[PDB]
Ligand binder design. Structure first.
Ligand SMILES: NC(=O)C1=CN([C@@H]2O[C@H](COP(=O)(O)OP(=O)(O)OC[C@H]3O[C@@H](n4cnc5c(N)ncnc54)[C@H](O)[C@@H]3O)[C@@H](O)[C@H]2O)C=CC1
Ligand SMILES: Cc1cc2nc3c(=O)[nH]c(=O)nc-3n(C[C@H](O)[C@H](O)[C@H](O)COP(=O)(O)O)c2cc1C
Ligand code: SF4
Ligand code: SF4
Ligand code: SF4
Ligand code: SF4
Ligand code: SF4
Ligand code: FES
Ligand code: FES
Lengths: 226, 439, 225, 156, 120
């Protein structure tokens, strides 16, 4: 398949969506709800690009790159001004209720939400009203729970139920009061519950064992091991 | 008002004492004749083409062609499990037509579902009815029992070998459940989040099977089409939208109510000749044509025919065609605050712009209501209207949410500007740190 | 037969444009203070003669570097685990220059013969209890069961019994019964296993006091303590 | 603890007969438990999940999604006043204030004797006869603040 | 709060600390050491501090006989008051609950609404 991103030609797989095709090409599109192993659901609305009908089209429309096939002869723009404004607005809407928590948050320096907030260029707060707040749950000895930091991207429930076939994690409530966790306090029963700390793009689900002796990612000495 | 079967196909069987019409009285008034004709003398594809060239459109509010929607079911013979769903949710503020249809004429809906399920080859049918319509549920269950005892429902209907079972699924109170894919999710026993399209429910809907979702009023328009023919339905009115529509006016008018009118009836004709105009001492200020999710229109738009195309080019939507009148004593900021509070709390929470941008508009409108607005609030509301439009959110709940806000800002900007009193302050002073004073 | 372990990773002389592979990020902090309480003189960088990695930030961790051993994923603007997108050939696929690790053997051209040693069916002998292995993700592995965070996640020690066998022995759920293996009379509480076949005792393999070699063994004088 | 009664369980299986997937009876199972006991208690989630063969997290997600499935204890009678746009034009605020004065409780609360619980609700589909309220199963239209105390006496 | 922003912002790398937590969840440094034989007094750590904990003060008289004594631990750094910023409290802003400050008690925070609440 042939796509044209910002006037540049690219050869991609037509069976892929535009988000994974553009990320495979090295282009940067902000995203939350999509994961490579979980598929596309189009929830967070972060991955907006401007799609044009043809080469001689200047109006276009905003589409979700994760929900749009990377079909042959597809004309899109990432750096379009309206697309950039909408992506910044999505980050801003996520920022309205987000707690002032980065210094005391185990995700800091390793946080996809921090990276996408910086990537969209959103650094000025004009929202002045109250932030919604949630109580936390005890999830056992491995996973720490902090629902204030949730951006309702649904990655956790999609991984835990649709991928890992777990039964004791879910989404509750409605509108801006959606809650992600167990129906009651208790240990997460899945043998693969620990992947939530990397699946969750925020600091809702964090490594409790690491949190005991916490340090930031830049301070780590890493090695590839088995 | 005189009601004839030829001019009022949906409401001519309505009794004067507002009592429901049961099977004997319905069948005495040409009931199930269209069902008999469709099930005996017509192929399912013939009925689908009959509805398609009759020009029947979706009465849920979008006006999509019903025959075209029926044609999109797969031609695969191995897909023998099919569902017809009747969207009896009707949760739009300002909409009360389906309650009238199912409370007093339940057999009309039952017959329309029978004809549609024969045309769609749907082995099962479900009436997705809201939980607050208690009398509609009682009357629909009684009508289903009466039709089952007389052979209109069940196995071997009319001796034709067609098996059709009709259920009534009572809802648990969310406005998003009326969205058709969210309706399917709710019918499956899940949280009523909508689904992305394509695939449309015609190919993979309820439990992955071919599914067709239709409004109560569309299925009620079906039997008169099948009984009187296509030619009668085309010559009801000389408008691009064929047939009759339940239209009304509500809200501080002399006669708030609901009347069956041809398409192309002007909104002024409904307001004065049917609703009696505004009440004494009240002056007309604005109106919404088709429910809470439509743009406001002014007095200059009252001389416009109630069609999809005419209201669409006026900057609004025809919607449910149940208009609401707003008098001069109603503050527009408080009205849009009420509307946005409804829309924000009825968010399903799936997607960011609606779930986290409708409450921001609610808070801004609440601040504007008590004169606590700050500069940049109206620009924020306009940006929210632009960025919650079609294609930006996952479903059409939020574009409908921001239609009245943008129309009220367009037409009544002086009321929104009057709430801006305080200067903008997002920060407090921190002792020891000199602030960066932006110009 | 182990000749393929040479190509599992390149030797210690491997370089990316002359430089080693960094073990720590470029913003690694506290270099002149993390050991300052022991001595204010900063020690020599630990030398790695064994591998191509260096015990410092002075190395390469570019996503476009021609290697297969990636110590951690980081790209500018991508500090989260999403930087693995930058380290892959396509997103969700393989690492850009191949996944590490090689297979020791290929599929052989010819197969084996059919195994004709079909066992006889299980028969419950009186007074002998066949040990059925029960494994636990938290507890059966030796080193991981030594981890302190696993003790809360570890199940309590137990013995699984069929309802018919427990009724024959006159024990209920929770009653402590004792058995002798290799001259070690140990006592465990009984829990009832519906799906276990009669004539078997379910034991948690790999736990403290229950070796994994007990799987398939037999038990004598298993009675209530 | 919680135990499903024989009538509740039988009604739940009868509703399970109506669909090709027993998960589709979750809303009506919660409504059956709520109709019998006024609300859905915490053990009812696990009981309905066990009967339906679906996880308890799914049942709780359904129960907390839908506003008319009550996961907190309510009074003997649930007043649901419409706070939508047409009833706002027709003056639901006077009706709400009359309910405040008569019941001495805020919306979302329950009276001290457990007789009434006051709740706002979306449009009841009765906008031409507004303002509207819904006490337990009866809808009352053409409301006036004077008729509210007379309306509240016939619900003991 | 032992967020380690000052240590990474230090161009000399002369700050070393470790996070610890109280029973109520308050983050604090288990230790905090600064190598003042390395420190260039550039003020980047104070600039990077999001709680105004670390502060460069008007005191230059810092000469020492042994270089090992220029390693200042937490007992040589923590003073009895707020220093240059008298009123700022990070934990009044943070959403994380600690002792004396529950969920919904920070600035610009609404009270938590349970998903089981009867209000729509
Ligand atoms: N109580 C009520 O009656 C309410 C009505 N509405 C109305 O709902 C409308 C928006 O609903 P939507 O479903 O989003 O409208 P839509 O325009 O997306 O589609 C309406 C119908 O046409 C079908 N359809 C449309 N394009 C199709 C295609 N290419 N292929 C196959 N099927 C296709 C859909 O499946 C659906 O059944 C608005 O006009 C609004 O006024 C909104 C809220 C409440
Ligand atoms: C948020 C939302 C709510 C809706 N609620 C209803 C409803 O309550 N009843 C209804 O018939 N259609 C409703 N619709 C429209 C449906 O999606 C669908 O178009 C209609 O029910 C069936 O199409 P039809 O008009 O061709 O019969 C809603 C749409 C949206 C976006
Ligand atoms: S989740 Fe990310 S953005 Fe939110 S407080 Fe934690 S580090 Fe900051
Ligand atoms: S808890 Fe994390 S993964 Fe789950 S929806 Fe919230 S931000 Fe996404
Ligand atoms: S616009 Fe988004 S959050 Fe709102 S009701 Fe539709 S899918 Fe749900
Ligand atoms: S003032 Fe000293 S401790 Fe602080 S950043 Fe500069 S060199 Fe490091
Ligand atoms: S002194 Fe400030 S920057 Fe350094 S760890 Fe403590 S709170 Fe963070
Ligand atoms: S990543 Fe595409 S909408 Fe979320
Ligand atoms: S607006 Fe109240 S009943 Fe519709």
């Amino acid at each position: 398949a042939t796509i044209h991103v910002d006037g540049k030609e690219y050869e991609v797989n037509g069976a892929d969506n535009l988000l994974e095709a553009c990320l495979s090409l090295g282009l940067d599109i902000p995203y939350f709800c999509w994961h490579p192993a979980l598929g596309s659901v189009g929830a967070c609305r972060q991955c907006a690009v401007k799609q044009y009908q043809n080469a001689e089209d200047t109006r276009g429309r905003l589409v979700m790159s994760c929900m749009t096939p990377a079909s042959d002869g597809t004309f899109i723009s990432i750096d379009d001004e309206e697309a950039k404004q909408f992506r910044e607005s999505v980050v801003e809407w996520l920022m309205t209720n987000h707690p002032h928590d980065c210094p005391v948050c185990e995700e800091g320096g390793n946080c996809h939400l921090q990276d996408m907030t910086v990537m969209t260029g959103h650094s000025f707060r004009r929202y002045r009203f109250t932030k919604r707040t949630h109580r936390n749950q005890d999830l056992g000895p491995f996973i720490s729970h902090e629902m204030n930091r949730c951006i309702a991207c649904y990655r956790c429930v999609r991984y835990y139920k649709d991928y890992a076939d777990g039964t004791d994690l879910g989404v509750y409530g409605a509108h801006d009061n959606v809650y992600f966790g167990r129906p009651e306090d208790g240990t997460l029963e899945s043998e693969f519950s620990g992947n939530l700390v990397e699946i969750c793009p925020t600091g809702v689900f964090t490594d409790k064992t690491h949190s005991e002796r916490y340090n930031r990612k830049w301070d780590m000495q890493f090695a590839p091991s088995i | 008002i005189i009601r004839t079967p030829e001019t009022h196909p949906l409401t001519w069987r309505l009794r004067d004492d507002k009592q429901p019409v049961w099977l004997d009285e319905y069948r005495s008034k040409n009931g199930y004749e269209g069902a008999r004709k469709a099930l005996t003398g017509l192929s399912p594809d013939e009925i689908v083409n009959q509805v398609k060239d009759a020009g029947l459109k979706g009465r849920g509010g979008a006006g999509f062609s019903t025959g075209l929607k029926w044609s999109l079911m797969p031609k695969d013979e191995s897909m023998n499990i099919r569902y017809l769903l009747c969207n009896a949710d009707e949760m739009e503020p300002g909409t009360y037509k389906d309650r009238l249809l199912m409370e007093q004429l339940p057999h009309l809906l039952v017959e329309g579902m029978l004809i549609s399920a024969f045309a769609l080859k749907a082995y099962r049918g479900y009436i997705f009815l809201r939980g607050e319509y208690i009398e509609a549920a009682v009357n629909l269950r009684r009508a289903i029992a009466e039709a089952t005892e007389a052979g209109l429902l069940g196995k071997n209907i009319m001796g034709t070998g067609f098996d059709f079972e009709l259920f009534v699924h009572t809802g648990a109170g969310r406005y998003i459940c009326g969205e058709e894919t969210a309706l399917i999710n709710s019918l499956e026993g899940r949280r009523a989040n909508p689904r992305s399209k394509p695939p449309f429910p015609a190919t993979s809907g309820a439990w992955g099977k071919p599914t067709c979702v239709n409004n109560v009023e569309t299925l009620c328009n079906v039997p008169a089409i099948l009984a009187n023919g296509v030619e009668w339905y085309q010559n009801i009115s000389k408008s691009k939208d064929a047939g009759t529509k339940l239209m009304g006016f509500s809200g501080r008018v002399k006669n708030p109510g609901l009347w069956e009118l041809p398409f192309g009836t002007t909104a002024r004709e409904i307001l004065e000749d049917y609703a009696g105009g505004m009440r004494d001492g009240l002056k007309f200020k604005a109106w919404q044509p088709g429910g809470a999710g439509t743009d406001f229109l002014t007095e200059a738009h009252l001389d416009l025919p109630m069609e999809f195309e005419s209201i669409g080019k006026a900057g609004s939507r025809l919607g449910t065609a149940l208009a609401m009148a707003v008098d001069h004593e109603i503050n527009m900021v408080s009205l849009v605050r009420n509307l946005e509070e409804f829309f924000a709390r009825e968010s399903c929470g799936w997607c960011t712009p609606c779930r986290d941008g409708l409450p921001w508009s609610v808070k801004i409108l609440r601040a504007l209501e008590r004169g606590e607005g700050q500069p940049g609030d109206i620009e924020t509301l306009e940006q929210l209207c632009r960025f919650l439009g079609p294609g930006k959110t996952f479903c059409a709940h939020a574009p409908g949410a921001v239609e009245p806000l943008q129309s009220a800002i367009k037409y009544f900007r002086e009321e929104f500007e009057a709430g801006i009193k305080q200067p903008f302050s997002n920060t407090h002073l921190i002792n020891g740190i000199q602030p960066n004073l932006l110009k | 037969e182990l000749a393929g372990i040479k190509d599992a990773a390149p030797d210690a002389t491997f370089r990316i444009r002359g430089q080693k592979l960094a073990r720590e990020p470029h913003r690694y902090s506290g270099r002149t203070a993390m050991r300052a309480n022991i001595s204010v003189h900063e020690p020599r960088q630990p030398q790695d003669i064994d591998t191509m990695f260096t015990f410092s930030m002075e190395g390469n961790n570019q996503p476009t570097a021609h290697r297969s051993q990636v110590p951690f994923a980081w790209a500018p603007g991508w500090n989260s685990p999403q930087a693995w997108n930058k380290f892959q050939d396509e997103v969700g696929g393989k690492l850009r220059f191949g996944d590490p690790g090689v297979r020791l053997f290929e599929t052989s051209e010819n197969g084996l013969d059919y195994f004709t040693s079909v066992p006889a069916r299980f028969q419950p002998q009186d007074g002998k209890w066949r040990i059925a292995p029960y494994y636990h993700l938290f507890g059966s592995d030796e080193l991981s069961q030594r981890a302190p965070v696993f003790q809360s996640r570890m199940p309590q020690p137990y013995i699984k019994l069929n309802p018919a066998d427990a009724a024959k022995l006159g024990v209920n759920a929770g009653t402590r019964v004792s058995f002798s293996y290799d001259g070690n009379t140990v006592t465990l509480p009984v829990e009832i296993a519906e799906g276990l076949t009669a004539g078997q005792v379910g034991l948690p393999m790999g736990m403290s006091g229950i070796a994994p070699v007990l799987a398939g063994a037999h038990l004598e004088d298993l009675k209530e303590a | 603890a919680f135990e499903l009664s024989a009538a509740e369980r039988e009604a739940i299986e009868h509703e399970m007969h109506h669909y090709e997937d027993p998960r589709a009876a979750s809303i009506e199972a919660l409504k059956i438990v709520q109709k019998q006991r006024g609300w859905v208690p915490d053990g009812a989630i696990h009981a309905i999940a066990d009967v339906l063969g679906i996880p308890a997290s799914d049942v709780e997600g359904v129960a907390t999604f839908y506003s008319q499935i009550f996961r907190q204890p309510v009074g003997r009678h649930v007043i649901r006043y419409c706070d939508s746009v047409v009833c706002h034009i027709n003056g639901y605020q006077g009706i709400q204030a009359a309910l405040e004065k008569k019941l001495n409780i805020k919306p979302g609360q329950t009276t001290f004797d457990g007789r009434f619980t006051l709740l706002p609700t979306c449009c009841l589909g009765n906008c031409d006869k507004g303002p509207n309220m819904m006490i337990d199963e009866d809808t009352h239209a053409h409301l006036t603040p004077e008729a509210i105390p007379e309306l509240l006496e016939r619900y003991k | 709060v032992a967020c380690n922003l000052c240590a990474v912002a230090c161009p000399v790398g002369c700050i070393s600390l470790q996070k610890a937590e109280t029973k109520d969840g308050r983050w604090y440094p288990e230790f905090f050491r600064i190598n003042f034989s390395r420190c260039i007094f550039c003020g980047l750590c104070e600039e990077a501090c999001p709680t105004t904990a670390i502060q460069l003060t008007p005191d230059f008289e810092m000469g020492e006989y042994k270089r090992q004594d220029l390693v200042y631990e937490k007992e040589d750094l923590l003073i009895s008051g707020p220093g240059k910023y008298p009123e700022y409290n990070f934990y009044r802003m943070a959403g994380m609950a600690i002792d004396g400050k529950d969920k919904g008690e920070a600035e610009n925070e609404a009270k938590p609404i349970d998903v089981k609440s009867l209000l729509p």
